[PDB]
Amino acid sequence: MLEVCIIGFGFSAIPLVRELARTQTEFQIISAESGSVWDRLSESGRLDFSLVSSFQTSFYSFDLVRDYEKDYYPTAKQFYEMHERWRSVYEEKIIRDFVTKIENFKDYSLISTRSGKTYEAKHVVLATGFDRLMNTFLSNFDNHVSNKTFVFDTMGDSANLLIAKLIPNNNKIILRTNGFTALDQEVQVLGKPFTLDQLESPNFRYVSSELYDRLMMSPIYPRTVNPAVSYNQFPLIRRDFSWVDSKSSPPNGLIAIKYWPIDQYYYHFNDDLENYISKGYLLNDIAMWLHTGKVILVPSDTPINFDKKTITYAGIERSFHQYVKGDAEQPRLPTILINGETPFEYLYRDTFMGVIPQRLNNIYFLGYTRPFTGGLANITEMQSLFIHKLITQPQFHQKIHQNLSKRITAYNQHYYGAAKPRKHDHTVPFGFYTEDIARLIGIHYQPNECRSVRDLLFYYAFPNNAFKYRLKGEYAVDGVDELIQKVNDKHDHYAQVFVQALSIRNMNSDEAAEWDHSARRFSFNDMRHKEGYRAFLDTYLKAYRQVENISVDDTVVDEEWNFMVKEACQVRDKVAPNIEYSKDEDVNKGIRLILSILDSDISSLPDAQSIEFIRRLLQPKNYELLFIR
Numbered sequence: 001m002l003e004v005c006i007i008g009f010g011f012s013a014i015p016l017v018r019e020l021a022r023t024q025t026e027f028q029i030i031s032a033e034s035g036s037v038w039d040r041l042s043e044s045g046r047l048d049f050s051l052v053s054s055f056q057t058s059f060y061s062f063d064l065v066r067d068y069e070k071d072y073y074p075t076a077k078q079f080y081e082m083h084e085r086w087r088s089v090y091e092e093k094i095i096r097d098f099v100t101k102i103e104n105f106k107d108y109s110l111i112s113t114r115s116g117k118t119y120e121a122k123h124v125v126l127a128t129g130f131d132r133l134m135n136t137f138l139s140n141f142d143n144h145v146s147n148k149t150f151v152f153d154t155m156g157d158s159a160n161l162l163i164a165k166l167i168p169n170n171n172k173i174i175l176r177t178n179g180f181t182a183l184d185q186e187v188q189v190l191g192k193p194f195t196l197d198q199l200e201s202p203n204f205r206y207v208s209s210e211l212y213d214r215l216m217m218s219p220i221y222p223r224t225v226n227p228a229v230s231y232n233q234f235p236l237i238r239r240d241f242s243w244v245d246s247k248s249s250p251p252n253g254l255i256a257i258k259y260w261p262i263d264q265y266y267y268h269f270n271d272d273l274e275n276y277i278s279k280g281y282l283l284n285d286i287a288m289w290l291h292t293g294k295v296i297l298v299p300s301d302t303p304i305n306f307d308k309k310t311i312t313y314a315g316i317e318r319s320f321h322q323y324v325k326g327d328a329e330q331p332r333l334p335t336i337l338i339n340g341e342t343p344f345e346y347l348y349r350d351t352f353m354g355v356i357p358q359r360l361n362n363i364y365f366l367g368y369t370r371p372f373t374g375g376l377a378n379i380t381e382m383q384s385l386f387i388h389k390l391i392t393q394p395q396f397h398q399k400i401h402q403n404l405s406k407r408i409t410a411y412n413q414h415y416y417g418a419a420k421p422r423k424h425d426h427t428v429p430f431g432f433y434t435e436d437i438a439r440l441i442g443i444h445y446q447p448n449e450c451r452s453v454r455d456l457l458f459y460y461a462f463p464n465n466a467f468k469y470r471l472k473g474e475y476a477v478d479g480v481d482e483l484i485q486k487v488n489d490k491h492d493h494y495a496q497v498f499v500q501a502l503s504i505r506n507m508n509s510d511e512a513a514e515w516d517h518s519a520r521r522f523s524f525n526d527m528r529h530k531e532g533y534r535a536f537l538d539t540y541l542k543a544y545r546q547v548e549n550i551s552v553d554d555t556v557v558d559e560e561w562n563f564m565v566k567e568a569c570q571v572r573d574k575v576a577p578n579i580e581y582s583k584d585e586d587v588n589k590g591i592r593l594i595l596s597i598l599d600s601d602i603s604s605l606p607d608a609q610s611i612e613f614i615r616r617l618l619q620p621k622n623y624e625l626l627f628i629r
């Protein structure tokens with residue numbers, strides 16, 4: 001009897017196949033001849049964009065240990081080339097066919113295929129990815145569409161990439177949405193670039209819920225009255241967060257788009273602009289679009305005529321060329337038959353850690369958990385370790401499954417509370433999820449085993465990337481020691497985010513929200529760093545057009561749009577003139593202090609009262625996770 005069958009091979013399955021090979025566990029992969037959206041984009045030459053996620057979080061530990069030299073954003077070309085490199089390694093273990101049905105029995109499954117070939121396997125892993133409504137827009141994208149009006153009912157990363165591509169053809173963009181969370185993918189800390197995933201210090205949740213909440217939520221919840229923040233200039237960007245019923249913030253189910261702020265885009269790409277655009281580094285600064293009026297927000301309930309193709313806002317009856325109805329994610333699951341009869345019903349919350357479904361025996365889901373920030377790699381590497389351990393170690397399989405339904409209830413209580421199921425429940429802060437799996441497997445760090453201040457920075461401030469948990473123990477990867485050293489040497493041992501937590505420990509949430517926004521350039525949606533880049537924007541559009549052989553007329557002037565932008569930007573035209581740094585000073589001084597006591601013994605530190613606090617990090621009081629204990 002075949003020990004393991006993996007269904008679907010693109011990106012998510014790679015780390016699991018690697019571990020099954022290492023332990024010589026018998027496995028077969030079944031995967032469609034057709035392949036993925038990445039094959040659609042490759043075949044049709046549309047891998048001309050870049051990831052919304054850092055290198056560190058988007059490539060597996062066993063690639064990073066070889067190829068990491070600096071933080072950067074990989075291109076769609078590089079990401080796909082990496083999938084193709086791993087497909088080549090394992091292609092001999094792949095049967096090219098399409099699974100149509102799985103019949104699940106007490107200790108095996110019967111797998112049916114389009115060819116008619118059937119397979120028996122004791123353990124079955126689904127790594128088939130999602131169907132996405134929006135893929136047709138990216139895969140069949142037309143760049144000749146010019147001077148047209150688009151209406152989007154949802155802001156997501158796909159809409160934002162479409163918008164980046166339309167705007168340089170003088171396409172006008174109306175968003176008719178119930179708000180959206182957008183975050184600068186890259187941020188300056190005392191004049192040095194940090195990808196946003198470098199600054200989450202997630203294990204601070206263990207100090208307390210409230211402290212972590214103040215560390216994280218002021219750029220997402222409308223907490224500052226600072227008029228430089230996009231959610232004050234353009235309030236139609238605010239969301240209804242009344243659904244959230246959890247002390248764990250950011251909450252599971254919160255989705256964000258991650259975008260190039262124009263200032264960081266300029267710092268990286270200004271010197272070789274056309275060549276960088278052609279590699280797929282597209283400016284996608286939604287806040288700059290709102291600032292310049294190349295995008296407008298309108299209320300959710302703004303009347304539209306689907307028959308005449310018209311949207312009803314202020315004075316002009318604007319005909320729209322296309323309505324984009326907004327991306328949904330549905331797992332590509334075959335029919336699964338419980339005891340080979342009863343259709344399995346998929347719901348993210350009714351699986352443990354997005355991986356283990358109830359009422360199925362030895363079936364695992366790999367790649368259906370979505371990270372709030374950073375790449376999928378962080379999530380699928382840790383899920384792969386979890387699945388490998390369940391498959392190959394019956395003691396671990398028994399430990400997890402014995403109280404499976406209780407673990408799931410305890411997880412849902414902790415992370416969702418009494419909220420009803422939502423379509424985005426599958427979205428998790430990457431640094432909670434990786435840490436959660438690491439504690440389940442037993443490859444976690446213990447805060448009580450920190451000796452030096454340097455050790456506290458590593459435990460609390462070093463990002464909870466999957467490779468963090470592959471330094472030593474059961475899943476160690478060779479070269480992780482050198483990788484961690486390199487990353488620490490380039491990021492000042494994450495002293496800056498450690499000092500952020502030290503700065504806000506005594507504040508309430510309004511105070512921390514004010515302090516967050518006291519910076520000369522605060523992390524996210526700082527509308528003071530837009531006007532100075534108006535000339536560079538024109539250079540950019542000219543560069544984009546030249547790269548893509550586009551010719552449009554700005555000497556042709558769209559009068560009617562010029563007119564609707566004024567109505568859209570009334571709060572901004574009122575709020576912006578009220579503009580005009582505690583955070584910069586606090587952080588600068590704190591980093592000085594921390595970097596001076598790097599190698600000081602914690603336990604022995606003498607009796608401001610930040611010392612008390614630093615000493616208490618050996619004994620955090622919010623460490624309990626009832627779905628693990």
Ligand SMILES: Cc1cc2nc3c(=O)[nH]c(=O)nc-3n(C[C@H](O)[C@H](O)[C@H](O)COP(=O)(O)OP(=O)(O)OC[C@H]3O[C@@H](n4cnc5c(N)ncnc54)[C@H](O)[C@@H]3O)c2cc1C
Nearest residue numbers: 008010011012031032035051052098099128129367375376
């Ligand atoms: C436009 C776009 C941009 C993205 N950008 C990023 C990014 O910036 N950073 C990031 O980290 N992630 C990004 N992602 C998300 C993620 O990395 C990709 O979705 C990735 O392809 C997921 O890998 P996967 O292996 O789970 O699924 P896939 O890559 O879709 O591979 C699954 C494979 O299984 C096959 N298959 C499906 N059903 C069956 C079946 N029943 N039988 C047999 N074979 C089957 C499919 O044909 C496919 O080849 C992006 C996704 C998209 C669509």
Ligand SMILES: N[C@@H](Cc1c[nH]c2ccccc12)C(=O)O
Nearest residue numbers: 196199200215216217219373523
């Ligand atoms: N802690 C950093 C970065 C940060 C805050 N909120 C976030 C949400 C997601 C990602 C990063 C962040 C700051 O306060 O600016």
Ligand SMILES: N[C@@H](Cc1c[nH]c2ccccc12)C(=O)O
Nearest residue numbers: 053132157158327371374375376
């Ligand atoms: N364009 C993809 C982006 C995406 C999906 N899942 C992700 C995980 C990590 C980074 C990016 C993504 C989407 O439809 O949403």
